Design a protein around this ligand. Structure first.
Ligand SMILES: [Mg+2]
Ligand SMILES: [Mg+2]
Lengths: 106, 11, 106, 11
């Protein structure tokens, strides 16, 4: 069967937004195929605010997360392979999920 | 002093 | 914050269906507000096939699961409060989830 | 001999 990660990602994203929390996505910036501003990468990772307010055209698909965001006013198109998505949680209280290390992503 | 995310709060 | 159960239910339901599994919902038939054919209740519970094939107008909302189904050819409208939804799994291999006992449902 | 669900397989 396919990985459960993308389904759980969508579930927690909606739960976070519906509860007025700001969804923060933790990404492994070293993962193959990741496209993010390297200047904002720290400790091999990057945290991204996925709220509709901080993004544009957000897509949460099975194999990837894609959206536009701004950095110091500059707009860029981010692309995150699902295997690089490590967790999603509330900026406000830390509630969310740290994804299980599903084999298929290794 | 709480650190936020990398991208700007508003797109 | 609101319960995570309905969001996880929708996530696993979609994951099950997308992987060609038949989603089986485990329900606490004794829970307040449950409307199911009492003749099919056993050990205080009832298992329901939620596939589109076995149901009609299935709704997976935050507070309830509602849909039409047939029993020995007879159609009936089932209503399951979210607190009564105990688990959802694949008829084929048992994969799925047994929901955590979120306090709000007690 | 595997038992199924309570409702009919087809609506
Ligand atoms: Mg926006
Ligand atoms: Mg149908």
């Amino acid at each position: 069967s396919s990985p459960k990660r993308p389904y759980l990602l969508r579930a927690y994203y909606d739960w976070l937004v519906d509860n007025s929390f700001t969804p923060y996505l933790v990404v492994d910036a070293t993962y193959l195929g990741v496209n993010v501003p390297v200047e904002y990468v720290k400790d091999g990772q990057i945290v991204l605010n996925l709220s509709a307010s901080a993004t544009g055209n957000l897509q949460l698909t099975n194999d990837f997360i894609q959206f536009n965001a701004r950095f110091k006013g500059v707009s860029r198109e981010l692309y995150i392979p699902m295997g690089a998505a490590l967790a999603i949680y509330a900026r406000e209280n830390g509630d969310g999920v740290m994804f299980e290390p599903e084999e298929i992503y290794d | 002093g709480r650190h936020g995310a990398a991208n700007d709060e508003n797109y």
